[PDB]
């Protein structure tokens, strides 16, 4: 029959398709953490100096 | 007369039409049946996939 075999081939792509769907959901979650932890990186060594306060002092020996 | 004859030409033919009858029964069960295992283990096929899950670990020696 037309039937009996479309079913088979129907399956195979229904599977196909939901095993790349798998993948890509995995996938966009790892490159989403990643964006967001360059951000957080970047504004920590902007906001980190550092001053010098006063004078400086030379003890001779 | 013919008939004599007759009757006994007669039984003849009906005699090979039975066997003929009989075999072509049992020959065309076989087939249904036979026919009927492909598609069931055509389905099975497709159907028993297998996907990795996470990431791949190596242990150092």
């Given at each position: 029959?037309?039937?009996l075999?479309?079913?088979?081939?129907?399956?195979?792509?229904?599977?196909?398709?939901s095993?790349?769907?798998?993948?890509?959901?995995?996938?966009?979650?790892?490159?989403?953490?990643?964006?967001?932890?360059?951000?957080?990186?970047?504004?920590?060594?902007?906001?980190?100096?550092?001053?010098?306060?006063?004078?400086?002092?030379?003890?001779?020996?």
């Open positions: 029959i037309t039937a075999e479309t079913a088979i081939i129907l399956i195979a792509f229904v599977v196909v398709a095993v790349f769907a798998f993948t890509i959901l995995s996938a966009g979650t790892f490159s989403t953490e990643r964006g967001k932890e360059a951000v957080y990186a970047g504004l920590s060594e902007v906001r980190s100096s550092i001053e010098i306060k006063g004078s400086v002092v030379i003890i001779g020996e």
